[PDB]
């Protein structure tokens, strides 16, 4: 299904830590950022999607409507600055981060009872996968 609305639970971080070094994120930053515990609310209105992913942490908070790019700044994540869009290709939600960075991006999908994430920067994938609660 293309409706991703809900307050999601974690129960699978595979590789964050390689994704973050993709990143160019400091050893002393990933060796306290990986966090196994996360609640992500997604709020979508048709097009229009307000996401919310919190852990102890950080706040990675971004909205965006399907099909508009626009001009993100990834915060506290990386501090960079991409052109940010978001697409169907059918029921899998495409996020392209073009910028500095080979490969940026992440793609996010409903399949069984389960929400899927996968982030992606450079030969690097992290695999996340939430329940519905």
Do not use: P
Not at 2 to 14: A, H, I
Not at 35 to 43: E, F, G, H, P, S
Not at 68 to 83: A, G, I, M, P
Not at 94 to 110: F, M, P, S, T
């Amino acid at each position: 299904t293309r409706d991703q609305n809900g307050t999601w639970e974690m129960e699978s971080n595979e590789n964050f830590e390689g994704y973050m070094k993709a990143l160019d994120i400091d050893f002393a930053t990933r060796k306290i950022a990986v966090r196994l515990t996360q609640t992500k609310v997604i709020d979508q209105d048709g097009d229009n999607f307000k996401t919310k992913t919190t852990s102890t942490f950080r706040n990675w908070d971004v909205d965006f409507t399907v099909g508009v790019e626009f001009d993100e700044y990834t915060k506290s994540l990386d501090n960079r600055h991409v052109k940010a869009l978001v697409t169907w290709e059918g029921d899998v939600l495409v996020c392209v981060q073009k910028g500095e960075k080979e490969n940026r991006g992440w793609k996010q999908w409903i399949e069984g009872d389960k929400l899927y994430l996968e982030l992606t920067c450079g030969d690097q994938v992290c695999r996340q996968v939430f329940k519905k609660k």
